[PDB]
């Protein structure tokens, strides 16, 4: 099921969707996995999140070239942390248009990241303003509210039963909400539930640090976050 390519792992989730996995070795802690997505939309490819580094992200582009052999139209990055935006330079060097929440772009310098080249903005209910997400095809971007970070965004894949929660969502058997360093403990539970309500028919929930899970990943994350309030 899992395909090893260089230092990365690729898993096909649907006929047109793959999960990319990259690892960062943390001294005395062990290797930390981070997941993103690759979506084929006809004659082009769309990417959600970079890998931890530029070299790992260049390896994602190399896998796309070999396995799909279609051009990457754009990438969406889900917040200004290393696991999601660490490889922006490799996207830019390749000529790929990059998009992130305007807030992620504003926080990127303080977070030691390079901003995406375009900014997404959101309505009062969390849905992306469509003029800011042109020709996004099946990528349905939703800002669920502050949680893992104040800028965290999520992506539903239209035409599939998949939705990507990024670092906001943890798996159904997680014992904690992960790095809470930049988190909004007050609003986390409502943000997790808002992601679930935005994509109510998504049955496969993809996240940054666990393998794809059922909707119990959303409800369990919300239940752990209810304890932070
Ligand atoms: N272990 C780890 C977990 C998280 C995490 N993400 N979501 N929940 N926790 C993050 S993140 N996205 O930066 O906040 C980074 C690391 S590290 N120190 O780079 O290994
Ligand atoms: Zn993060």
Which CATH number fits the domain that encloses residue 122?
3.60.15.10
Rounded to whole angstroms, what are the CA distances from 136 to 32, 131, 219, 229?
30, 10, 28, 36
Contact 88, 45 (CB under 8 A): no
Please give the torsion angle defined by the CA atoms of residues 206, 207, 210 and 211, in that order, rounded to the nearest 10 degrees.
10
Q: In what order do the strands lie in the sheet with 154-157?
A: 139-142, 154-157, 162-166, 204-207
Structure tokens at 133: 């997400």
Q: Is 118 annotated as a binding residue?
A: no
Mutate to test the pocket of ligand 1, among 179, 185, 207, 217 (most ligand atoms within 8 A of CB): 179
Range list of β-strands (E), 82-203: 97-101, 118-120, 139-142, 154-157, 162-166
Let me know if 19 is exposed, middle or buried by CB neighbors in 10 A (0-12, 13-18, 19+). buried
Rounded to whole angstroms, what are the CA distances from 63 to 4, 128, 187, 195, 207?
10, 29, 38, 30, 21
Cα separation, 131 vs 119, in Å, equals: 11
Q: Would the CB of 170 count as within 6 Å of ligand 1? A: no
Which ligand 1 atom minimizes the distance to the CA of 32? 20
Question: Which residue's alpha carbon is nearest to atom 16 within ligand 1?
Answer: 179
Q: Is 167 annotated as a binding residue?
A: yes
Question: Which residue's alpha carbon is nearest to atom 8 within ligand 1?
Answer: 178
Contact 122, 194 (CB under 8 A): no
**Secondary structure class of 92 (helix, strand, coil):** helix
Q: Which domain holds residue 139?
A: 2-227
Contact 45, 73 (CB under 8 A): yes
Domain count, the chain: 1
Q: Would the CB of 26 count as within 6 Å of ligand 1? A: yes
Q: Tell me how far the alpha carbon of residue 43 lies from the centroid of ligand 2, in angstroms.
A: 31
Phi–psi pair at 36, nearest 5 degrees: -135, -170
Contact 23, 35 (CB under 8 A): no
Mutate to test the pocket of ligand 1, among 26, 29, 108, 167 (most ligand atoms within 8 A of CB): 167
Beta strands 118-120 and 139-142: pairing type?
unpaired
Q: Would the CB of 32 count as within 6 Å of ligand 1? A: yes
Buried b or exposed e, range 50-82, using 16+ CB within 10 angstroms = bbbbbebbbbbbebbeebeeeebbbbbbbbbbb
Cα separation, 38 vs 87, in Å, equals: 15
Cα separation, 123 vs 133, in Å, equals: 13
Contact 74, 48 (CB under 8 A): no
Cα separation, 131 vs 9, in Å, equals: 34
Q: Would the CB of 135 count as within 6 Å of ligand 1? A: no
Rounded to whole angstroms, what are the CA distances from 115 to 81, 103, 142?
11, 10, 19
Phi–psi pair at 216, nearest 5 degrees: -60, -20
Cα separation, 125 vs 120, in Å, equals: 14
Q: Which of 107, 136, 101, 106 is nearest to 122 (CA)?
A: 101
Residue that the structure tokens 């800002």 belong to: 143
Q: Is 161 annotated as a binding residue?
A: no
How far out from the chain centre does Cα 70 lie? Answer: 21
Phi–psi pair at 82, nearest 5 degrees: -50, -40
Q: Tell me how far the alpha carbon of residue 83 lies from the centroid of ligand 1, in angstroms.
A: 7
Q: Is 83 annotated as a binding residue?
A: yes
Range list of β-strands (E), the chain: 2-5, 8-14, 17-26, 30-41, 44-48, 72-77, 97-101, 118-120, 139-142, 154-157, 162-166, 204-207
Residue that the structure tokens 């504003």 belong to: 106
Q: Is 187 annotated as a binding residue?
A: no
């Amino acid at each position: 099921g899992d395909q090893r390519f260089g230092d990365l792992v690729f898993r096909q989730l649907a006929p047109n969707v793959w999960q990319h996995t990259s690892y960062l070795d943390m001294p005395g802690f062990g290797a930390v996995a981070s997941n993103g997505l690759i979506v084929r939309d006809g004659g082009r490819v769309l990417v959600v999140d970079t890998a931890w580094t530029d070299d790992q992200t260049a390896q994602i582009l190399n896998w796309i070239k070999q396995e799909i052999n279609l051009p990457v139209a754009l990438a969406v990055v889900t917040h200004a942390h290393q696991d999601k935006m660490g490889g922006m330079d490799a996207l830019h060097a390749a000529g790929i248009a990059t998009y992130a929440n305007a807030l992620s772009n504003q926080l990127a310098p303080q977070e030691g990241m390079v901003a995406a080249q375009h900014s997404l903005t959101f309505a009062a209910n969390g849905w992306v303003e469509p003029a800011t997400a042109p020709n996004f095809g099946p990528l349905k971007v939703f800002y669920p509210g502050p949680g893992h970070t104040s800028d965290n965004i999520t992506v539903g894949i239209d035409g599939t039963d998949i939705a990507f929660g990024g670092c906001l969502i943890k798996d159904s058997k997680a014992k904690s909400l992960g790095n809470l360093g930049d988190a909004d403990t007050e609003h986390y539970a409502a943000s997790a539930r808002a992601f679930g309500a935005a994509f109510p028919k998504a049955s496969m929930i993809v996240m940054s640090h666990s393998a794809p899970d059922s909707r119990a990943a959303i409800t369990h994350t919300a239940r752990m976050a209810d304890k932070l309030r």
